[PDB]
Structure formats: structure tokens, C-alpha cells
Design a protein around this nucleic acid. Structure first.
Ligand SMILES: Nc1ncnc2c1ncn2[C@@H]1O[C@H](COP(=O)(O)OP(=O)(O)OP(O)(O)=S)[C@@H](O)[C@H]1O
Ligand SMILES: Nc1ncnc2c1ncn2[C@@H]1O[C@H](COP(=O)(O)OP(=O)(O)OP(O)(O)=S)[C@@H](O)[C@H]1O
Ligand SMILES: [Mg+2]
Ligand SMILES: [Mg+2]
Ligand SMILES: [Zn+2]
Lengths: 432, 339, 432, 432
DNA sequence: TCGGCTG
RNA sequence: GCCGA
DNA sequence: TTTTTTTTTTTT
């Protein structure tokens, strides 16, 4: 791809702006490519601007080589065209080409060094380095890349980090003042959040409430459900968005005119996003399945999610571990790590749910030690809320959601807070 | 599997390929071709490593250049999807029905057709002078003089063959060779081997058959009573009483007569695993095989023993008669001798 | 028309955005076209964009291939060119070609399946599906059109959701008003429901009673018995549906005339379904076994069930689990998850049974924490019932049900209703 | 196979009356087979009877056939024989041939349909089916089975089920009036039963006695013993059968003459079964073994068992469980499940013994909770008899047998019974 | 420079 | 590919 | 088929 690299060096500007610092005449060849790049470098050195084709011809005329290679050079510069390629692929391919040629040059260099070492010192060369330098120069070829930043320097990058503080660029509002207060800005992008609760306590109720709240805040919400069917999740959402109890739905107590009117009233709002509910077989979805789902949702429709709600991570499968090869701890930890990797790759808040141990299903207080499946789930999670329901709490339609883990704020400031739950409407309300 | 349909579809899907050749021997169906996966070599156009073997219970395409061995169905899927679907459908189509391929079971063979009467450009060894270069060479070979009436010397071997089988060589370049006529049981020559002279002949050291059905066993006409010893070299057989030698790369037990009393006397190499393969396939048939496991000499063939280690024919015969083992007894010596 | 499809994949943004997500490597051919599409798919996966011809023929084609394949790919790419063609005919012809190639692949696959199955075992190339699933695969090739149907969009599909609401086309009502008034219409189609009683407290009287109830409602019932023979389950069904004591069937107080007359009277009714009872050895049937049985019943008896009642979930086996585990939790939970996957695949209410803990025996109440087989079964269950008749209800021929878990409604509304068991007839009646 | 099918259609009455309803003219060929079957169909239609070979020859004589077809049909007719093959293999093989040819016909039909579809619609065959019916056609291919018996179909097998009821085709008597009274006819085939030995009861003795009583009724019995030698178990059998005290056998009071006389007297009775004692090392016998032992006994000794008494359940081995322990709940549960599966698949009654807890030991009344292997064994054991010996019963030479679990009948009907145990004679007698 | 060669 | 000429 | 770490679960 030397032709492409030279053509985009001559014509493109941003590509030259980024790729020129990591360029050496040794990278290309010993023939037409080397002489062409030498002409380019000489012209940019003399006059600090990328030359033109006419400039190349003038340089060839005034500065000449032997005719046998002169003809090759002149016929090499007859095919460099504009060819407006994309920038990401061009940069990546130039990086791969320079890395491959650097490896080849380093290998040939170490071979020449060893060959010189084999020779007697009487007739050996002096310019070639010594054998003890063979390792380090290989490193010099190993770490060649266009990534101008190896990592984040604390003092060199005091700027470009203060921007992330003025504009939050990570926080996503919760639409529930208590959650924002205990989170200081809401769940952050590229993070995995977990609602942990016992059987039939309201894990999916809470996930649907959060999904609806995000939907009201103009957010793309992808509700990937493994346990419930698409229609069931949609109904649990409609119970929240349309302010009609589930009993009012299953008893036909809402006229179709009312349903259509409320749906179109929500649609007319410009502050309404999109909610996609996807169903997968229980235990038949992994990280790569979610990645394929995201790809198809991006392609088949102009739908890129900003929130991903997985119904239950425990009933997913690990994308690396073969199914049921490892015990609960290893498998569930791998699943959590894969989900968090998906979250950080998509820069999307990945809510999900988890079950608690059999001992906590009738416990007025739920501790982190009661997490079912792996104990590495709290380790890999970024914000964990335990949903607790008791007879006394049920008597007033309230729960005891409590902060089990928090990477967003001091979990002890507001550890336990009552959260009213309208199960008929499947909605979360804050006590005020 | 369905080998006949495999062969048909392989022929259909490989005929158009360059350097195709339908090598069909009386028991083997093979196809030679430049492998499309690798292309073999520009120099090695005729040395095409693409081969197809359909003589097995399944048809396999193997190329030693790219080391690509696969069933015919896989090749059809990867290269001829239309023909792949055709084959995969018709195999099921005829799968339900009974195989009818045995119905047209006919033999296109023929009896002795090119019976060799006289040999132009050939002078028999016993007819030659004692100072002839071939005579000195066979003196170095230490062949007994009495058997020299079984070997000829020639200088026009391509001319001789083209007089017998015209068109074998586009050029009749004069070539001295040791013509060994291979006769039948009744004593008439059915083929002849142009044994190379000096260290090695220029090219094409091959036994020319008068016809494809001609015998490949030398000395059958001279077989007398007693056990028959089967060797690998006709010259070696000349040192063996009741010793016949198979001439060819294929070793068929059925064509070799004296099933009751045939004794296989092979080389003295425990290495060369092809030899071990031959020994194993002979012993699995429960045949009489001689074993060199106790041989005082360490040469390769009997003539090599005589020339280099000074072995005498009587020692060879007494070793052979005392070292014939069969069945488990043979298998024991085979197992210990191989390595 | 592969050349046209690729030429408009590379040189047309709208065509790509319309047709790419349905495109696949198994659609074009076994020649240069497949390799060209492989390169295109690799580039799209790497850079989320359609490459240009320069990217393909230089940056991409220069990879692992064969001389023949390289020449063919280069010839095809040089043969690619943009041609002005209307973007309604292009999409339609592309859809037709994709459907045709899907049908071709499906036919080839089913022919290969037939060939493989005709081959005897020990060479039968496992992981290849049996002959029984020949039609659906072809049916899969039928619905392969370019219809962007991924998930259930909340706003774009309110009409279909309302149709499902008004038809109530998920509920399969019980014959008992009491269960219908707590399940808001009965059990739902793609759901796994569980009964827990203990030892000789029920757990098959209830399952047989529900089978009889679903039979009297015209539903197809498949009673897959694991702990009972094919005849004892049918005997309990006879006792329920003939109003005859189960002992009376044993001693011989019922003549053949009475039995035959009652059976024919039941047959003459038009509201009677088919209660097919099939037995498998205890511990020797998995979800794959049940899928094969369903396929066989569909093929032979033209019997597609709407209710599947497995006599015992705990003495089943897992299809995914390969090495039997001494750990009850994971084994039972995997079995339950596979059963629920089967239920949601066949849209059949799947009733089954679970064993309660030893502590719950002879206890006036049973909580959800009394499940013995696994705490993961209530996690993937949809509706659980408990039988808690200790001594007093036995003397009064009663059975109290606590409704430990309910995904169909608030489980606290009608927590207790004292089901009217009749053990001699093996049935349930209300106490209205 | 066509020749055999036609020959056994011509020269049989049972095979014809079984396989004719599933034979179609398209099943055979387009040549001699099709024409011959056409002649058979024509003859059976014009005259409602299977044609004879000369009748078929006459039909060939008077029919529209071409010269080659005439010769082929004549030869095939002359090639029809009256070979008396067995019935089951003939049915199975003709069913397999019919299914294979039906699959071939359906595949050819769908292939021709797809070929017809890819034609200009103006030039197409109207009679050909549409593409959308392809999944149906293959279904009709798989809806071909000579005997459609999959599970017990209610309302379609009421006569067979009633015949099983009247014939008591599942029960096997006990030779004791009390046991038949508490089991409504005795133990049932394809079932597992367990004796819960208490504080020193002798698990072997009861299994020993039942083994005997089952022997005196003419049933084939196989006592797989673990904790005892074949000679010891056979000595207990001799004690129960010959009325000779066990210790008397050791002392030598009974002489060889009397022993042989009693043995030959028992041999004279035609109502005596066969008992096969087989020993296995403690813990070296799982259920799968027993299957191989049954195979060997059937193949070699022609001994087809109806009773299989295994000496001790706890001493047994799980079929597929690596970890082994002397008394563990998971192991006993797995062993019970595997043994019951063996009983079901063999259509044989299986008996075993098990131990209970100390609470059951001290108390005369034994509850299912007061069981060492409760929940596990109770779950997979059709019959469970708690055998308890008390000091007062020891003085009275009796034992208190309690029906802990009876899948056969009601638990409380006749729960506790005093049994006349004779330890020296190893015998059980009834109590007046 | 040719043919024949297992996996 | 290895062997034979 | 043992064997060891770890976790999770469950029974007594
Ligand atoms: N369809 C429904 N109609 C009415 N109330 C419901 C419905 N589904 C759930 N509920 C109520 O909401 C509570 C929690 O519901 P879910 O969140 O769906 O259960 P869950 O937390 O997902 O527990 P799992 O995942 O099934 S173990 C239940 O206990 C019921 O009181
Ligand atoms: N033939 C019968 N006559 C009368 N009552 C019966 C009969 N068979 C069973 N029962 C009653 O049914 C109950 C026995 O439980 P079942 O309904 O058979 O299921 P189950 O035995 O509890 O399941 P498991 O796994 O075997 S504990 C007891 O209440 C018995 O009284
Ligand atoms: Mg849930
Ligand atoms: Mg039961
Ligand atoms: Zn090749």
C-alpha cells in the first residue's frame, strides 16, 4: 500500500498532519518508493509545505538520479491520485504497514549484526552495533505506533481532563431525585449497574421503571430480556408510561381510544426516545450475542442505544467459558466482566439484575454477602442497589432499596432509603 | 459411501483442470492434476501434486504440495457448489435404491497378444565374448556363468522397444542395456526389462510389457519341484534355485502362483518402513516369509551379500530353508526384526 | 446477480444501509464472490464502514489466500463498477436473490441431514440436527425477507401490543374460577409453572387435576410422566373425568359398560381435547428429549400441544450439562431454564413439580424458602403454587394454597383460598 | 427390498392387513415395481382380496403394458416367492423402506417446486404448489409411520386401559395376604421398592424372604448381593425354602440325604421359579452394571427376570458419580433414581433396602421425616416399608411393619401391621 | 527431464 | 513434499 | 478415577 500512502501524503492534509512524524525513508523500499519518499521529504524540508505533482516533476528535473532508476521514479509518480478514502482505515492501514516494515527492518538488522559478529574482528565492520544491543533495538521496533499518547499523564494532561469536569460527559440523569442525590449525577457511561433482589421482589419492576424514566429523558433504551417475553416487558413498561394499572389492562378497563390517545400524546413529545425490547432464550445469550444485537440495531434502524437494560445477568452465558464448564462463581464473574466490557466499549450505562441467596428472601435486611451466584459480581459491578420488601413495607406499598456498592459516591451517606413501589402501575415513586 | 458416484463426479469436476490424467489401472482409479488450491509449480506442471484416489471405500483428493487431503464432497462444496449440490442430491437419490453397478461386470482383457518371438539389437550374454564390457560388469556382479543364457545385451534399447512397441520413444537414441526377457509358465517371453548398465542409465529404466496382461514374474518357466522363493530382483533370483522375481511396483498375491509353496524373500533392511509394510501385509495373509533376523551378513540383497560380504549361494539356500516362518511364528520374527 | 449486488454494496450508501444487515457469507457462492464478501465483511466489522475498491484490492486482498482465489478476487473486484439502477428494483431483486439462496442452502442442508441420518450411528456426525427438524429449517428459509423486525419497539408497535391485550392471546384459562381470579385470566403461553406439595401431599393429584381441567377446556395436553407409568397417570385422569373413586377402579365396583359409556359420552362432546400421556425413565429425559417427543407427536399423531405437564422437574436431566453434578442447585436450575426455553419456544404452558424442603413437611405454612431442589428454580419459574394441608384439611378434604410466587399478579392479594381437594376422585373443586 | 415387500404382500394375510393402509403407488419406482403394485392395487380394488401369483400373472396378461414393461412385470411376477420370514423384522424393514422412499419423493417434489419457481411467471406450471407450502410437504413426508403408538392416548385407548385394569397386568402378588391388602394387588412392574431397616433389622433378611416368596410363585428372581457372598445368600434362600434353620445348616443337623430330598421335592413342583444369585463387590456395582448383568443372563442362561432384589441401596454405587461415600444424600438419591430407571426400562419389579436415622430407631413410630435418606429415596421409591423390631416384638417373634410410602395405595388404610418374622427360618408369615 | 507416492 | 530412473 | 484448591449450595 505504498502507492496509497504516498498518494495520501501528497494530496490529503489531515493524514499528513498525523502520520508524518512517524515516517522514515527506511520504511518503504530501496527502489521507486524510497526515492519518491526522499523527494517528498526533501521538498517538505526546503519549503515547509506538502509539494504538488508539478513540484515533484521539477524536483526530478533539477535533482536527478541515474536514468535507470530515474525512469522508474518518474513512472511511479503518475498514479498518485486524490482518492478520498476514509480516515480511520487509512490511518490503521498505514500503522500496520509501518509496523510490519519496522519488524522486517529490525529482523534484517539483527541478522546483519549477528553476521558481522561471526566475522573475525580484523575484517569486521565498525558501524554495525554490538550483539548486546540486539534485544533493545527489537523493542525499538516493537513499540512503533501512531498513538501519540501511551496513557494519561497526571501533570502533562491537566488540560483535556478539566473538560471532563465542566461538561460531565459521563453522568446520565436518573429522573428520580433520590437516585441522583445518592449518585451525584446519575449512572455514568461505560459502567455496569446491578439491582440485586430475591425472587419476585421487583428486579424487573425496577429495571422497567429505570428504562421508562430514561425513555422519558430522550434516551435510547434497549431492554434485552432473557426471562420475560417481549410482550410482557412491553406491558410492564406501558403500566408505567400510560399510568394505567396492569389490572386495568388485563381486565379490559381501558378503551382502545384511551390507549391510542395516550400513546400518541407521548409520541408528540419531542423529549421521547426509543425503547427496544429484545427477547433471548434463558441461558442463550452472551456478550457476543449482545454485540451482534447492537450491530443489527445500529444497521437495520437508526437506533444506537445510550442505555442497555439486561433483564438478568445470571441467566446469561459466558462468551469465553464453555457452558457450565466452571462453577457459579467463575462463570458469573466472567459474565459480569464481559457485560462491563460491552458497557465500556459502547459507552452506555448497562443496567441489569441479580438474585440474592436463598437465606435473604425473607430478610428485612440484605447484605452484600447475600449475593447469589458469584461473589465477583459486586467486584465487577459499578453501582449496586439491593431491593428489599417486607410485609410492613408492602402494607404501605414501599420498598427498602439500599446501596450495596457504589463507585459514584460514599455509600454510607444515604445507605437505606424507602422507595414507594406501585406494583399495579409497576412504577417507582419517591417519598416526599 | 458411494465410490462410483464419487469417481464420476471427480472425473467431471477435474477433467477441465490443467494437467489432468485419468490413471485407471485394473484395480485403481486415480486422477492426476495440478492442484487448484496451490497450483503446484510452474516448472512442475507435469509434476502435479494434485491426486484423487477413488479406489478406496471413499474418494479422497490429496495434494502433497499444499498437504490438502479432503473428501470429494468437501472439494465440491469449496469449488463447485452447483456440482456439489448435484452430487449431494444424487448420492441420496441412489442411496435408497440397491447398487446396480455390479450388473455390467465385464472383463475387457485378452490372452497372450504380443508374444515376443525375437529380440532385434540384442545379443545374449552367453553368446558374447568373455572380454565384452557387459561381461566384465556381470563378472563384477558374480553371476554364475550357466545362467548367462538368460540375459541379453543391447545398444538400441529405444529402437528395440519401438520395434516391439512403436511410439514408446519419440527418439530412438542408442542405449546399451541389459535385456532380461520375462517369460510365462510355458516358457515364452511376455515382457522384457531394460536393466540399467554402469552405475545408472540416463533415463527410463523400466520393464516394457508386450501387453498389459503380460506376466510380471521372472523365471516362472524354470520353476521346479519344491518351495518357490519370491525375491525382488531377477538377477537376485538367478542366484536362487526355484527363485522367481516379481517385476513391478504393484505386489498382487493372486497373480503369483504356487500359493501352497511360494516363499517371500525380501530385502535385509529392518529400516525402510515400506519394507516393513510389505512384510506386515504378507504375514497378515499368513504367507511364508523368510526373515533375515539371524543373517550373518548385513548387505541389502543376496547379490549384494555375495559381492560385498563374500556370501556363497549354498549358504543363502541353507539360510532360506532354515528361516521360513508362518503365522504367529512369522509375526514374532517380523516384530523383533523391524527395529 | 452477485456482481451487481457487490458493485452497489461498495458504490452506494443507501443500498448498503438497506441490505447489508441481512447479508451473510452463506449467500453468494463457493468461489471468488464468497471471498470478496468475506473481505467486505471483515472491513465492515473492523471500521464500521463500506470500504472503497482501493481498500479491498490493496489493503484487504493482500492476505491469506490461494493463487487461484487471489486471481479470481482481483478479477471480480476489477469487474465491479457503479451502474445507474433504480433503488427500488435493486432492493427487490436483492431480496429475491437472498430468499432464493436461503432456500438453496436450506435444501442442501436438509439433504445432507437425510444422508447423515441414513448413515448408521458412530459415524453420524453429531451436532447435526435430526430429520425431525427438517420442515422448520425450510420454514426458516421462507421468512428471510428484508423486514427490519428486531425486538418490539415500544412506540412503533403499540397497535400489535393492543391487539395482544384485547385478544388476551396469551392466557390459557383454568377450569377453576379461583385460579383465574388470582392469575388474572390463567397461565400464559410461554411460561413454566411449578407445583410444590412435599411427599404424598399432592404434586401429582394437582398436576393430574390440571391436566383434566385443560382437557375439559378443549386444549391439547401432553402429560410427560417421569415418576409414574403411562397407565397410572391415565388412571388418575380417568378417576378425575369419570367421577369414579380411584379405589373403585381397582376393586372392580365399576362394570365395563359404565366405563365405556362414560368414555363415549365424553367423546361425543365437542369441548374435549387430547390427553396424550408419555413416560420416560426417571432421570433419563432432558429438554432435548421433550423437543424430540414434541416433534414426533406433531409428525405422527398430528398432536401439537398447548399444555405440557411434566410430572417432576427434579428428576429430569439437563441437556447442556454433560457431566452429572452432585450439586443440586445448578442441576435443577439448569433443568428449569431448559424447560422454560422449551415452553417459550413452543408457546405451551409448561406445568411441572418441585420438591419442598424437609422442614416444610407437617408445617402449617410453607414459604418460598422451603424449596429443596434449587433456589434457582423459583428464579426462572413463572407461577408457583404450594399445597399445605397438614392434618386438619386432610380430615376436611381440603387443601390450602399459599401462592408463593406469581408473575401474573400481586401474590399477596388472595394469598390463601383453601382449594377443595378430593383425593378419591383425584380432582379439585371450589368452596364457593 | 421391493421384491420382498411385493412377495409378502402377495403371499401373506397378517403382513398385508398390517401394512396395506400405508402403501402408495409412488413409493416403489417408475418401472417394474410401480407396475406390479398397480396390478396389485387394481386386483384388490376390483375383487376385495389379495391376488394369487397366477391371478397376478393373469392381470399381467390382460393389461396395458409395453413390451419391455410386459417382460419386466412378467419376470418380477415369476420372481415372487412365499418365503416365511419373521413378522417384526418384516414390518420394521418395510416401514423403513417406505419412509426412505417417501423422503426421497418429498425432496424431489420440493426441488422441482423450487426449480419451477425460478421461471418467468408467464411461463410456469399452475398445477405446481407454491413455495410457501414447502414446509408442509416435508411434514407429510415425516407423517409416515406404519404403527403410530407414541405414548398412551386418552379417549383413544380406553379399551386397552380397561383391559389392563381388569387383567391386573401390572400387579405381582406377594404370597402374603397383608401385603396384597396394602398394595391393592401387590407390587407393580417397572417399579422400585425399599425396605427401611431400623435399629438392627437385617436389611438382607426381608429382601431374602421376599426373594423367596417371589420364588415360590414361579417368578424369575435375581438377587444381586453386595455385603454377602453368593453362598450365604443362597443359604438364607435354602433356610426360607426348605424349612431348615440357618444355624442348623452350619451345625450339620440336616444331612445330605434330607437336603437333597427336599431340593428334589421342590424341583418336582411345577409352581417353582428360578433364583439367580450374583455377587458384586461393595460399592463396585452401579445400576449400569446391573443392565449388563441382565443382558448376560438373558443371552446365556435365557433367564428373563421379573423380580430383581439388590441387597443394599446405600452399599450400591451411583451410575455416573465420581465421588463415593458410605452414607451421603446425593449418592442415595442418584442410586434410587438410577435403579428405578432400570426397573422401568426392564419392565421388572426391583427391591432394595436402606437405613434410617436414630430417631426412627428409638421410637416405634417412624415418620418420613425420621428417615436418614428422606426426600432423596422417598422421592424415587414407589413402595417404602419401615421394618422395625422391638424387644416386645422380639419376645413375640414379630415385627412392626409400617407403610411409610405407598404409591400403590392410600397410606392410612392399613398402615401398621404385625409380621410373623422367624429369624432362624428367615421367613415372614401372617398374623391371625 | 519424467512417473508414483496417504491422508 | 519422499522415492526411482 | 483421585486430587486439590474456591465458591455455592444444601442438608442435618
Ligand atoms: N404481570 C403482572 N401483573 C401484576 N403484578 C405483577 C406482574 N408481574 C409482577 N407483578 C408484581 O411485581 C412483583 C415483582 O415482579 P417482577 O419484577 O416481574 O419479579 P422479579 O423481580 O423479576 O423476580 P424474578 O426475576 O421473576 S425471580 C411481583 O411479586 C408481583 O407482586
Ligand atoms: N389409588 C389411590 N387411591 C386413593 N388415594 C390415592 C391413590 N393413589 C394415590 N392416592 C393419594 O394421592 C396422594 C399420593 O400422592 P400423589 O398424588 O400420587 O403424588 P406424590 O406421591 O405426592 O408424588 P411423589 O413424588 O411420589 S411424593 C396421597 O394423598 C394418597 O392418599
Ligand atoms: Mg424476572
Ligand atoms: Mg408422585
Ligand atoms: Zn495443492
Amino acid at each position: 500500500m505504498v502507492e496509497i500512502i504516498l498518494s495520501h501524503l501528497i494530496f490529503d492534509q489531515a493524514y499528513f498532519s498525523k502520520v508524518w512524524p512517524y515516517m522514515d525513508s527506511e520504511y518503504f523500499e530501496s527502489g521507486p518508493a524510497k526515492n519518491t519518499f526522499k523527494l517528498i521529504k526533501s521538498h517538505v524540508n526546503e519549503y515547509h509545505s506538502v509539494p504538488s505533482i508539478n513540484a515533484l516533476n521539477v524536483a526530478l528535473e533539477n535533482s536527478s538520479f541515474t536514468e535507470t532508476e530515474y525512469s522508474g521514479v518518474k513512472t511511479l509518480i503518475s498514479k498518485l491520485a486524490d482518492s478520498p478514502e476514509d480516515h480511520s482505515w487509512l490511518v490503521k492501514e498505514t500503522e500496520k504497514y509501518v509496523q510490519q516494515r519496522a519488524m522486517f527492518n529490525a529482523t534484517s538488522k539483527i541478522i546483519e549484526i549477528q553476521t558481522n559478529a561471526e566475522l573475525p574482528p580484523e575484517k569486521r565492520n565498525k558501524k554495525m552495533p554490538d550483539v548486546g544491543a540486539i534485544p533493545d533495538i527489537m523493542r525499538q521496533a516493537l513499540s512503533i505506533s501512531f498513538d501519540s499518547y501511551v496513557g494519561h499523564d497526571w501533570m502533562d494532561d491537566y488540560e483535556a481532563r478539566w473538560l471532563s469536569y465542566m461538561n460531565k460527559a459521563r453522568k446520565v440523569p436518573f429522573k428520580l431525585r433520590i437516585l441522583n442525590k445518592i449518585t451525584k449525577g446519575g449512572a455514568e457511561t461505560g459502567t455496569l449497574n446491578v439491582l440485586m433482589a430475591g425472587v419476585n421482589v421487583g428486579k424487573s419492576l425496577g429495571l422497567c421503571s429505570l428504562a421508562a424514566d430514561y425513555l422519558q429523558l430522550g434516551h435510547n433504551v434497549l431492554y434485552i430480556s432473557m426471562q420475560m417475553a417481549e410482550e410482557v416487558c412491553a406491558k410492564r413498561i406501558d403500566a408505567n408510561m400510560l399510568d394505567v394499572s396492569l389490572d386495568d389492562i388485563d381486565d379490559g378497563h381501558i378503551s382502545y381510544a384511551e390507549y391510542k390517545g395516550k400513546m400518541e400524546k407521548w409520541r408528540e413529545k419531542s423529549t421521547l426516545g426509543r425503547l427496544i425490547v429484545k427477547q433471548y432464550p434463558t441461558g442463550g445469550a452472551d456478550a457476543n450475542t449482545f454485540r451482534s444485537l447492537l450491530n443489527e440495531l445500529k444497521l437495520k434502524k437508526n437506533f444506537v442505544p445510550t442505555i442497555i437494560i439486561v433483564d438478568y445477568l445470571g441467566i446469561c452465558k459466558s462468551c469465553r467459558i464453555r457452558v457450565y464448564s466452571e462453577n457459579s462463581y467463575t462463570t458469573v464473574k466472567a459474565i459480569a466482566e464481559e457485560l462491563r466490557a460491552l458497557a465500556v466499549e459502547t459507552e452506555t450505562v448497562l443496567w441489569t439484575a441479580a438474585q440474592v441467596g436463598k437465606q435473604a428472601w425473607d430478610s428485612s435486611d440484605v447484605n452484600m454477602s447475600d449475593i447469589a451466584e458469584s461473589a465477583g459480581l459486586p467486584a465487577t459491578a459499578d453501582f449496586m442497589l439491593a431491593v428489599i420488601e417486607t410485609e410492613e413495607l408492602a402494607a404501605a406499598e414501599q420498598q427498602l432499596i439500599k446501596q450495596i456498592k457504589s463507585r459514584y459516591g460514599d455509600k454510607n451517606k444515604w445507605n437505606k432509603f424507602l422507595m414507594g413501589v406501585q406494583k399495579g402501575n409497576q412504577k417507582w415513586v419517591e417519598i416526599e | 459411501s458411494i465410490p462410483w458416484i464419487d469417481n464420476e463426479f471427480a472425473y467431471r469436476a477435474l477433467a477441465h483442470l490443467p494437467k489432468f490424467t485419468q490413471v485407471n489401472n485394473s484395480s485403481t482409479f486415480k486422477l492426476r492434476f495440478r492442484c487448484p488450491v496451490c497450483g503446484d509449480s510452474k516448472t512442475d506442471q507435469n509434476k502435479a501434486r494434485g491426486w484423487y484416489y477413488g479406489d478406496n471405500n471413499e474418494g479422497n483428493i490429496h495434494c502433497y504440495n499444499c498437504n490438502y487431503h479432503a473428501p470429494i464432497g468437501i472439494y465440491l462444496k469449496e469449488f463447485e457448489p452447483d456440482l456439489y449440490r448435484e452430487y449431494i442430491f444424487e448420492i441420496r437419490k441412489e442411496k435408497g435404491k440397491s447398487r446396480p453397478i455390479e450388473k455390467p461386470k465385464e472383463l475387457p482383457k485378452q490372452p497372450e497378444k504380443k508374444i515376443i518371438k525375437s529380440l532385434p539389437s540384442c545379443v545374449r550374454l552367453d553368446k558374447l565374448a568373455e572380454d565384452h564390457p557387459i561381461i566384465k560388469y556381470v563378472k563384477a556382479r558374480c553371476i554364475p556363468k550357466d545362467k548367462w543364457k538368460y540375459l541379453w545385451f543391447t545398444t538400441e534399447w529405444p529402437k528395440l522397444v519401438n520395434s516391439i512397441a512403436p511410439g514408446t520413444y519419440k527418439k530412438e537414441i542408442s542405449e546399451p542395456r541389459l535385456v532380461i526377457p520375462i517369460y510365462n509358465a510355458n516358457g515364452k517371453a511376455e515382457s522384457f526389462q531394460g536393466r540399467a548398465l554402469k552405475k545408472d542409465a540416463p533415463q527410463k529404466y523400466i520393464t516394457i510389457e508386450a501387453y498389459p496382461e503380460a506376466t510380471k514374474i521372472y523365471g516362472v518357466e524354470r520353476v521346479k519341484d519344491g518351495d518357490v522363493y519370491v525375491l525382488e530382483g531377477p538377477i537376485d533370483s538367478l542366484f536362487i534355485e526355484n527363485g522367481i522375481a516379481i517385476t513391478g511396483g504393484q505386489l498382487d498375491l493372486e497373480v503369483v502362483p504356487f500359493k501352497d509353496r511360494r516363499v517371500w524373500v525380501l530385502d535385509n533392511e529392518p529400516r525402510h518402513p515400506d519394507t516393513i509394510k510389505r512384510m506386515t501385509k504378507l504375514v497378515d495373509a499368513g504367507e511364508r516369509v523368510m526373515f533375515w533376523d539371524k543373517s550373518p551378513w548385513k548387505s541389502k540383497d543376496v547379490n549384494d551379500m555375495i559381492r560385498k560380504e563374500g556370501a556363497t549361494p549354498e549358504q543363502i539356500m541353507e539360510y532360506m530353508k532354515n528361516n521360513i516362518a508362518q503365522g504367529l511364528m512369522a509375526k514374532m520374527r517380523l516384530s523383533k526384526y523391524a527395529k
